[PDB]
Amino acid sequence: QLDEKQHIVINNGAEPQSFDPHKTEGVPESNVAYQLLEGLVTSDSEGKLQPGAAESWENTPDFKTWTFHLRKDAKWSNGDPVTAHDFVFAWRRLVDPATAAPYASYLSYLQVENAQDIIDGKKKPAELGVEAKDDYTFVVHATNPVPYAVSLTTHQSLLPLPQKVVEKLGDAWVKKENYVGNGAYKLANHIINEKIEFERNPLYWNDKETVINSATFLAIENPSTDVARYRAGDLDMTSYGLPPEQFAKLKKELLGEVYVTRTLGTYSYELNNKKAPFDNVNIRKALNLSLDRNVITDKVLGQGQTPTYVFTPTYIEEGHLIQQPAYSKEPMAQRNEEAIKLLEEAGYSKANPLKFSILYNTNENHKKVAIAAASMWKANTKGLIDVKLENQEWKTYIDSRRAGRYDVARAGWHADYNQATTFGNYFLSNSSNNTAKYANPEYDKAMAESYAATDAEGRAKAYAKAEEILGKDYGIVPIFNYVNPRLVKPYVKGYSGKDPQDHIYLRNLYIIK
Amino acid sequence: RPPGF
């Protein structure tokens, strides 16, 4: 009882910055890229790893050499061959400073030889420690043991690009008219702020197992709008936010359609550490003391989000030694008194309060959390803090964070791979992902001496120390560990509710009748 | 990756 049509409409939640995987860093972007392109390895509905462009792979016993065997007859959507040269080209372009990739640092996380030096402009991109041993053998050379390397390769930043096309056309290769990819789908249409339309890529190596023939991604920013369209039956899966007010109702009324995936994600307010006055540790500490997490998780959202005071989710692999900081165990009244003293010491008063804006991406749930935070900060400090809200469109919000044009910004980080360092690495001084501009050489040293570590206990202790240092510096304001609530029509199959990264590959779905 | 949510 497979449906005859096999069409699906999904809310992607925003207009993506770009379809170039080297120019982007967000979930709307990766969701698109993952339909059009495929890296060495990919995943099933529960996030378990399965062959992608590589049909086979192995590692040396020291976990430093990774050899990928590519498919000898695999073709790009235009019929050009997919070779290890495309991977060499793409990974070089990622770390090349002229690309200005937001995820430039990702191959540094993988410990690829010379990756950090290329990022720092000290070596040329061609000096990166990856190679096409022949057209269908791609080898990756790491300077330290990286036993979790395969899982890293599934990330959008490590997707290959069609070298011959990109070289001919430059950055104009991403135009719908020119876009060539090696994933299960290709672009049929793109209307800015409205819809992206996908069609089968018939040259996909695994096209014979693809079931969905076509799909539409919408760009609905507000969960209530999302939910109304679902109810009208004009889309089949919502994005991963739902209205907290409607939620208990939706669960019972639309029983079996409400999915809630426990995800490897942390929601935070990021403090601009190099802008006055958030360069003052004392002020960063005040904000942390005075913000009640349980108010947001329990009363503003109440969907299963759990309160947290560290960046790494402690339930991630090798995260188990990370401790919640001591102040989180103190009464709020004790916390609030400390915050007021600190703010008074920094020269704030009811007459002259600490004034700043929360920047967030347009989204009613974010607005709700911002209003609560603003509200808690004023009341909890008896008028020493006065907060405004600045909402921006997704692309504009990303540009602002990246450019440092913010005081405090809503921030979500979802694991790029199921191991602690996907969070740990974010806060390195030199990480291209560090929009906080947090910099502590003791943090960097804690993480650096972890890559050397040979067993999981040793790595786990270093990550606990890194967290303790970020904690004492009050680098950001962690709030909660994510849950991913979505509505999914009963006739949509292949969505598990068990993928810790909550990826959606069209090629994993099918419609039943 | 930075989430939309």
Provide an overview of this structure.
The complex is a heterodimer of chains A (513) and B (5). Helices cover 30% and strands 21% of the residues of chain A. With 513 residues, chain A is an alpha+beta fold. In chain A, the strands form 5 sheets. In chain A, strands 12-16-11-15-13-14 form a 6-stranded mixed β-sheet. Chain A has a 4-stranded mixed β-sheet with strand order 1-10-9-8, with helices on one face. Chain A is globular. With 5 residues, chain B is low in regular secondary structure. Chain B is rod-shaped and about 10 Å long. At the A-B interface, helix 1 and strand 15 of A face loops of B. Chain A: InterPro entries: Peptide/Ni-bd, SBP_5, SBP_5_CS, SBP_5_dom. Chain A: Its main location: other. Chain A: This is Periplasmic oligopeptide-binding protein. Chain A: Residues 48-434 form the Solute-binding protein family domain.
Helices and strands, with pairings:
The complex is a heterodimer of chains A (513) and B (5).
Chain A: E1 7-11, H1 27-36, E2 41-43, E3 49-51, E4 54-59, E5 65-70, H2 84-95, H3 106-109, H4 115-119, E6 130-134, E7 137-141, H5 149-152, H6 163-169, E8 185-191, E9 195-200, E10 214-218, H7 223-231, H8 244-253, E11 258-271, H9 281-290, H10 293-301, E12 306-307, H11 332-345, E13 354-361, H12 364-380, E14 385-392, H13 394-403, E15 408-414, H14 421-424, H15 441-452, H16 456-472, E16 476-487, E17 492-493, E18 510-511
Helix pairs in contact in A: 9-11, 10-12, 15-16
Chain B: no helix or strand
PDB class: peptide binding protein
Keywords: substrate-binding protein, ABC transporter, peptide binding protein
Assembly: dimeric
